């Protein structure tokens, strides 16, 4: 179709433009004292939120230039929610602020390319900074801190998640779901994690975690490509008789067969998710064995010679419970017989031995490490279906919270360890004054997130800024209480993994605009 | 869709200009001497009323933003009188009031996080100076009084009143219908109440009280979430045979079944309406046979294995009649047999000998009480239809008044509870000059509802504001005769619930919207 | 339709307009400090890329004959890519640079048809120029260095090239595809390659690529041609069972059959891809045998009173993975027996020696070469799907890259061979003034390239442009590193078929837009 093509700098402008309105929206969400955000639905009253996350979901612009600048931070800001889960928000404003100078700079006739080395190489910087800067996060004393801090000073489910971290490990797979009533319980149950999600959303019942939610599933595995649902109907009919939802672990469902499985699901002809097999090549095949052993399934191969019109609903596997992410699918309790998965165990245990790799042997240790780990189920109690469901939410949050503290420490919230840590980058020099300003551009950006907090707080941004500077470690302003001090001690704090992810991506949208040169897009 | 989205001081005139459209719609019907509202129907007629509520249902403007503001107060407000029975235009000129100062405020500078705590201090203290102003009702001869004044001095519906909150407890459950003529009718029957309301509006055959009511209706008591009407035809027909109407009380109706279930019964396609199952977990399941007993139908539970397809007429249960809230449904003489009723309670009632917990105790003594203690039933009698229609109404609005009152008591009516509570809160202050002013705006819209209602006399706010302020208790004006003295004497009240509801309703959302930045809406 | 029709320079500027847009879209990215064009997608966040051709792919201008000059050029670079693997966006810059140049001396006067003469002198010129510039790469250790160059320095991939290339020969056929784990592998399998493309695009299921991929085709050989897919519907159900793809190698396939056939794959409904066979008359009856032997399916002519509507799916031949390029189809790993296939070779081998002519003997030394060479196989590991997946990508250009080098060398890159070459012309001449100032713009736009280059990082083009030229053989800028030097030595070169290709192509649509006069469209 016809297009509209933009180059320099009145594309930049129209880009700028665009974050600027998504920024705006979201970072008045931003600290303690964050404002509230209508966001209008077609049908009743409007919502109101101070979650910058829902409010950057509904941001799309009319202009598609402009458009196109929002959609871009958009989307790597989300990559940082997902990664850490939380600092979309901070990645948005980081974004603008570095941004905003950069272009700046390139309108002031240095070199584009330079700028984004610099603010690169500024950021490597502050991520190395900031790693020394952290606080590790390790016996389960910690852990339960942090815990109780992300879900709102609530001990209880600081308790609750360092007890199952201790069942199931630090590296152990932790799941959520509704309580029975009045009193939690922690359960470790046979089952397994692996890394695809829903082939498709639509396929999610759970609209409010974004998930999909099959219970007593059947599992299908099928070791190569659907494409059309001529294969299907005998099993899909087998499972429509038991009247059971189903899984289907195939190498990947494509076009017709796909589209055939969203649409028949959304009209309740039968409840099915369908989602990648974990990993490639060769090691994918052992791995839909595993689920297979572990769900009492049977793979069916063409490699073998099997054809999926022949299969039957005892081929198929079967576990009390399946939750699907965007990118992830947990299988929990399968039905497989121990003797079976212990087995299976066994097998994957010697071939550790005759391992004639470190990368070969860590591969195998991965999968017995999954059959043999089992799941950890966490049912939050409340009494009342309300708080229970509140409660269950918090936790989550904090069990995502909590696991990458683990992983990475934590450093100071309220934007200080942005600040600190730039601070500490003054000397820090590139190849020539362009990748200088660069630099320099991104140093500035870094105090963004804190001034914004101190300015929805109604204080003066510079005047925080400058003290929080002048103190070291992980001294800074107490947005709530307007009071200076040791951020961790006063309890605010951030998973080290979401500062750096934050400000990673933000770094990494803004080079590639910075950089941007032309836009193409549709005739209005 | 392309979005329009709104900041800071342009946002919230858009709200304000909304909600004044709201307000002086509404607050012209306040007091004795309101006016009337016309309000226009495409088929015949227009409607002239006097009702608030009725007036602000119809409100809806046509710039997105402005309208967003009205719909915001809109649903706040009506949450007072779905709380107490009354107080909806109050709350509405109460927000009204505090969202212009509380705007200003802002405007010159002041801190929106500080307005609104302030505010909320003003209120606490507010909520806490009414129920000390309060005068209890609570024997039998206080409620008939209470009961008769809310019903326009009618003495006859205050002794129907008193005698039926007598047979079934101030807690027990009253229900009111149509007599058989001349003549009134209290009975007690098999019966039960609880906690859910219908799932969407729409389901609403009585727009004057918002309520859904089915006559001889069948209930499906379905231990599940339906989603796809697909599982319901075979049942939906059994039923659109016998014509008769049906109530869903499953886990939950979801999207494609409820979208079905929300235009065919608005297509007189078979009357139906569905609502939540009452509860959650374990208990949930067991509340639903309590239910089933009650009304001698049959759980149609996923567990034993049981589909909905395979439902027949007969596992349906059935009574007399239903009635349904925004919140809260009430099954009306159930056709359960009073063997098997009586032996649901007798279960119940050992299990709380085996209670090996209070909290389990309790909840078990929750149940039975619903189960045994059945519904009253009053049935208005008058002689003429019309007349019998009218003394009904009367009779359910003086029911839901004297409801609240028993409650929290009552308290001077016309505005002057609110402006003596506010007067007694004078040197109250917070924490800096933001939140005094918070306060201080909080304590002057305390005056908005009595002023409205002097203004709308035709005398002089300001002098009668004045006057009122200068006495003590439940000395006030009578808008009415234009005389001072003891409201409660003069027998001019409210029920200190929904003056409290009213207050504390009206502050919320205008905090909200004080504290509000960003504003998103679809393009016009 | 009325037309829009536009004469002399009234034409000429509309289409100089349209390359521009087209031209400074793309050489945005040219250099090593290429910048970011990013395109909109209708769908989610926008594309960022610094890749030439998908830009080019995107650019469609609204005004009919501005958009017929960038389609023209678009076109003709396209087959520079689609030739050597590379040189679209060159070819591109080149073309903008001679079309401007050409039309101001058209403009001036100059007769169109001498400039075109003059350019076209210069171009044959330089061409020759670039074989003496032109470095061999022969041995197997050269071929390593090119493809480790042209895979961004990964000496594993040049490893990976060479010893394919020794395994097949230089003339050899290799193809890539996914590994199946952290490993390489590679495989001479059954296999031939001939010359035909996709009988339509839409065919393509690899817009990466721009190539049609297949995997276990039923591949049905039809010595006619197919019109009507009336005569398909038996052998395409037969292909709908069993569930696999299909390719169809027919004399042509037109019209009606052609139309449904790109619907219905267009739709999940069966994926299938139609190319011509390849060449023509009596030898091309001989090549679909060749095929058919190859695939182990049976080739279902007219002649011997064949019929399409009576092949069943054992006529089909069938292979491992056939790919399709817009001129290219290529059958990997047959499952015709080596009993048949050997059989077959030893057939053509004999023909050989009753050959009564030197071509005929030539075309039957071809035929055997195809069937008897086979196609090397090489599977890409990585150990995480993804860096498997990007490492094949680099895998697939240096493969492309060397291929080249392989036929023609390798010439100094980063734009200075062409300046060098230009600079070598200086004193050539034509036959009269208007022919020399041809010769001028030709040899003015060959230093476009590396003044752009130049351009996008920052340096002034004329002083680099001026130094290059100053030296001698390979010496030139390296772009990257801003020092002076031996651009072979520093690892920076192109193969000199695609520098010797994009300028013959940009100069042949820069000659034909030269000598337009007049230009048809719709009218609007
Ligand atoms: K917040
Ligand atoms: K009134
Ligand atoms: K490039």
């Not at 059971?244 to 672990?249: G, T």
């Not at 297979?292 to 099997?306: D, F, Y």
């Not at 121990?338 to 087995?343: D, L, S, V």
């Not at 919230?413 to 003054?426: C, D, E, P, T, Y």
Request: net charge negative; aromatic share 2%; hydrophobic share 45%.
């Amino acid at each position: 179709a016809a297009k509209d093509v933009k180059f320099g700098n009145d594309a930049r402008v129209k880009m700028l433009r665009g974050v600027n309105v998504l920024a705006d929206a979201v970072k008045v969400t931003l600290g303690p004292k964050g404002r509230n955000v209508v966001l209008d639905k077609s049908f009743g009253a409007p919502t109101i939120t101070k979650d910058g996350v829902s409010v950057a979901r509904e941001i799309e612009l009319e202009d598609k230039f402009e458009n196109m600048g929002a959609q871009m931070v958009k989307e790597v800001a989300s990559k940082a929610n997902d990664a850490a889960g939380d600092g979309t928000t901070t990645a948005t404003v980081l974004a603008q602020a570095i941004i905003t100078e950069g272009l700046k700079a390139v309108a002031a006739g240095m070199n584009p390319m330079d700028l984004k080395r610099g603010i690169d190489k500024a950021v490597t910087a502050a991520v190395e900074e900031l790693k020394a800067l952290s606080v590790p996060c390790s016996d389960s004393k910690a852990i339960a801190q942090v815990g109780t801090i992300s879900a709102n000073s609530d001990e209880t489910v600081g308790k609750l998640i360092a007890e199952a971290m201790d069942k199931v490990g630090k590296e152990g797979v932790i799941t959520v779901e509704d309580g029975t009533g009045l009193q939690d319980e922690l359960d470790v149950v046979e089952g397994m994690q692996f890394d695809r999600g829903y082939l498709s959303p639509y396929f999610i019942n759970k609209p409010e975690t974004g998930a999909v939610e099959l219970e007593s599933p059947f599992i299908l595995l099928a070791d190569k490509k659907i494409s059309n649902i001529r294969e299907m109907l005998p099993v899909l009919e087998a499972v429509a008789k038991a009247g059971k939802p189903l899984l289907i672990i195939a190498e990947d469902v494509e076009g017709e067969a796909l589209a055939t499985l969203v649409v028949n699901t959304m009209r309740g002809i039968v409840k099915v998710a369908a989602v990648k097999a974990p990993g490639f090549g060769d090691r994918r095949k052992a791995m839909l064995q595993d689920i297979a052993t572990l769900t009492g399934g049977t793979v069916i191969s063409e490699e073998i010679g099997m054809e999926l019109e022949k299969a039957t609903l005892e081929d198929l596997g079967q576990a009390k419970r399946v939750v699907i992410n965007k990118d992830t699918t947990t299988i929990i309790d399968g039905v497989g017989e121990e003797a079976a998965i212990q087995g299976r165990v066994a097998q994957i245990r010697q071939q550790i031995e005759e391992a004639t790799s470190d990368y070969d042997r860590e591969k195998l240790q991965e999968r017995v490490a999954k059959l043999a780990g089992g799941v950890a189920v966490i049912k939050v109690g409340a009494a009342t279906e309300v708080e229970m469901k509140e409660k269950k939410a918090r936790v989550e949050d904090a069990l995502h919270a909590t696991r990458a503290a683990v992983e990475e420490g934590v450093v100071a919230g309220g934007g200080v360890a942005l600040i600190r840590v730039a601070s500490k980058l003054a000397d820090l020099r590139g190849q020539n004054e362009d990748q200088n300003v660069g630099i320099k551009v991104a140093l500035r950006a870094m105090e963004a997130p804190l001034r914004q907090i101190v300015l929805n707080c109604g204080e003066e941004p510079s005047v925080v800024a400058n003290t929080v500077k002048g103190g070291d470690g992980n001294y800074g302003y107490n947005a709530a209480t307007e009071e200076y001090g040791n951020m961790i001690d006063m309890g605010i704090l951030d998973p080290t993994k979401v500062t750096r992810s934050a400000l990673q991506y933000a770094a990494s949208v803004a080079g590639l605009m910075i950089t941007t040169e032309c836009m193409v897009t549709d005739l209005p």
